[PDB]
Design a protein around this nucleic acid. Structure first.
Lengths: 42, 97, 56, 62, 99
RNA sequence: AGCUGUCAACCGAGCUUUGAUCCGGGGGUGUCCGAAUGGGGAAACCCGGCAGUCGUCAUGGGCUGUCACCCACUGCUGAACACAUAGGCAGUGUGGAGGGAACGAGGGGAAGUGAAACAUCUCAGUACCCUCAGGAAGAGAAAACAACCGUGAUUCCGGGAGUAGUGGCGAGCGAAACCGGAUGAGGCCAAACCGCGGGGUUGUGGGAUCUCUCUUACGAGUCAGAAACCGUUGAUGUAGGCGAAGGACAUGCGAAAGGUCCGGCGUAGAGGGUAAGACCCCCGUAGCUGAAACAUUGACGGCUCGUUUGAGAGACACCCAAGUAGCACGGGGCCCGAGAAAUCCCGUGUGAAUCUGGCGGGACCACCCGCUAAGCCUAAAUAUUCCCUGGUGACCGAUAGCGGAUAGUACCGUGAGGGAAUGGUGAAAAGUACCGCG
């Protein structure tokens, strides 16, 4: 996922653990990987 | 002979001097050369004798200070030079040209 | 400076009744003594502590 | 340079003589104004430099 | 400097687009080349002193090799390839041929 | 596949696919001054000795090596004087000398200032100076804390805390116990006793010496516990290589990277250039790939070293760092400014003991607790950037930013020393041929 999506101009990538307020507000949409979503919520 | 104890007289004799005074001196069999500044009259005499196989009678040396020259940036100084005037025995000549 | 033990001079303060401090110096008690080092006669500056101890 | 390495010590000493003599003549010609190819002065000097290098290499057994 | 001396190139961005030409001389340090025919300037020189028309260098990134493919000419970019002895040979990329 | 550095154009002449220029590693040359070191000297100058060598009838003259002082060691000689030393002579040493931006240890040590004056005090153990270093330094394996419970070498960071304290109790100064963290490591000698070697290394005390009882190959290494080298090979460094994908139409003015339409790559939409805003024109980036040579550093083999009787019981009071500890005086530093002043350091006098020894636990005494001074070594956490490689900036953009878009130059001063100002044509010189007034 990192290597595939990092080059897209509009996509900003984060770890679940370093999800931060600034990135959330800038971004129009947030897309989690199921592994990421469970890691964050837990 | 080795590559450190090798000396050739042609190193002392840098080049001849071409000028009106030097030309005037040719007629009297006095040849003017520019020589290595570290040489003395004795070296000049031996160098000329070995290079040209001529009999040297007397050697005069003139030490000439380099001429200071102005530039865009400032002042430079040409190299200092030592000139030797070699008087040869009667009947002996050197073809410098 | 004792040439034997290396005892050097100490530095400190001379204190008055008014408690004004100034610099002074405690020089060791060094006496010039004729001694025999390695069978050769020689004159040394030695401190009386070394003399008392018999180091010379 | 390779062509030099095949010469004996005496041949190398020789070649140095002619090299030194040739530079001597070029310097005289240049001073008197008859030199045509200024590049030769540099060329002969480089040959002169080579011959010392090989002579020294043999002395040190490099 | 991929543009060698003596190649057929095409000016892609300049006063004179389209014009092909040979590479007269290349300056691989300032990244410019001379293509005979383009940027032909008229120098005002005095003493035969007079107007002289010769071509001035154009930037290397304003030309590009011309390789022949299926009849007419076509501009191509250049890559490299070793053959067997580690020898890079200019290989055209528009055609995949050997230039 | 071009090249002959730059200001900096220009001419001329050359080198180059028989591989130049350029780049990296190694090697040769390296005038004279400078610690300067054959002697001298106003640094870059002058004059020599000794050996060898070229040259000449020969002096004169060339060229190479070598010659300062101090220290370490080996030999000869040994003064006044007789041993004898001092000294002298000979032979060697990859010994020392000087330089360096900051950081370190140990010593010496201001004043302006504050105290609204000033001397105790502060500034401040700062500025500066002296000796010595290393890549770090210093410290460091308990004669330590604590408090009757206990922790267990040192260093550094945050607390404790601006607290206890200290102070012309003024201005000010200012811990420790202990807590949370970074890193984590322990070794060896002297002594007694035996012939520089063996011996042994302690705080539950241990060791020696004597008597009795029983018993009688292996590990460690380039390090603080010794020290080198030879090879094989792994990794990193000092040059590099490859590295994806864009066209058409019009406009513009002069140039398309901008407009319109359709496309493509993307483990590459970082950045810079290209004649105006370029992921696809170039240099690159993502991603891989590379070393004859030498450096750094691993692993291994050779190699080197250490050990090869041990344990218990009883004796004995032999040893356990001396002009030292303590004490007296005069001082320094610690929260502590000499005070009832402990511990720590210095000078002068006086001056022990060896385990029933000794030291500390804030005068002192007793008990209790801890620990063995007067010997040494020790990596890691810590401070710094003259220099090298790669990057960053809600840093500057030519009176700004370093003084310096190179300058410690010009200029000023005898001298230490002070010390500037000057960036911009255009995409490309296409830098105005020719004509005229002069």
């Amino acid at each position: 996922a990192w290597l595939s999506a990092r080059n897209l101009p509009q996509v900003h990538i984060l770890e679940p653990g370093q999800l931060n307020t600034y990135d959330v507000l800038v971004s129009d949409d947030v897309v989690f990987t199921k592994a990421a979503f469970e890691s964050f919520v837990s | 002979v080795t590559s450190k104890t090798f000396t050739d007289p042609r190193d002392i004799l840098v080049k001849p001097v071409v000028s009106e005074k030097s030309y005037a001196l040719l007629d009297e069999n006095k040849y003017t050369f520019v020589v290595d500044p570290r040489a003395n009259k004795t070296q000049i005499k031996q160098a000329v004798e070995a290079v040209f196989s001529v009999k040297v009678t007397g050697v005069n040396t003139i030490n000439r200070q380099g001429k200071r020259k102005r530039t865009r940036t400032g002042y430079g100084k040409r190299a200092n030079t030592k000139r030797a005037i070699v008087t040869l025995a009667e009947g002996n000549r050197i073809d410098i040209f | 400076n004792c040439d034997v033990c290396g005892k050097g001079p100490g530095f400190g303060n001379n204190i008055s009744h008014s408690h004004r401090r100034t610099s002074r110096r405690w020089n060791p008690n060094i006496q010039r003594v004729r001694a025999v080092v390695g069978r050769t006669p020689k004159r040394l500056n030695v401190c009386t502590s070394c003399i008392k101890a018999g180091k010379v | 340079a390779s062509e030099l390495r095949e010469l004996s010590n005496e041949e190398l000493v020789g070649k140095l003589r002619e090299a030194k003599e040739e530079l001597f003549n070029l310097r005289f010609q240049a001073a008197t104004g008859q030199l045509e190819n200024h590049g030769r002065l540099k060329a002969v000097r480089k040959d002169i430099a080579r011959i010392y290098t090989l002579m020294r290499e043999r002395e040190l057994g490099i | 400097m991929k543009i060698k001396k003596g190649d057929l190139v095409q000016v892609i961005t300049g006063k004179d687009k389209g014009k092909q030409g040979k590479v007269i001389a290349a300056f691989p340090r300032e990244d410019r080349v001379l293509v005979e025919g383009v940027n032909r300037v008229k120098k005002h020189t005095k003493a035969a002193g007079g107007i002289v028309t010769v071509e001035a260098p154009i930037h290397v990134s304003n030309v590009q090799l011309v390789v022949e493919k299926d009849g007419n000419k076509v501009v191509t970019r250049v890559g490299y390839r070793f053959d067997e002895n580690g020898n890079k040979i200019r290989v055209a990329k528009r055609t995949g041929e050997d230039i």
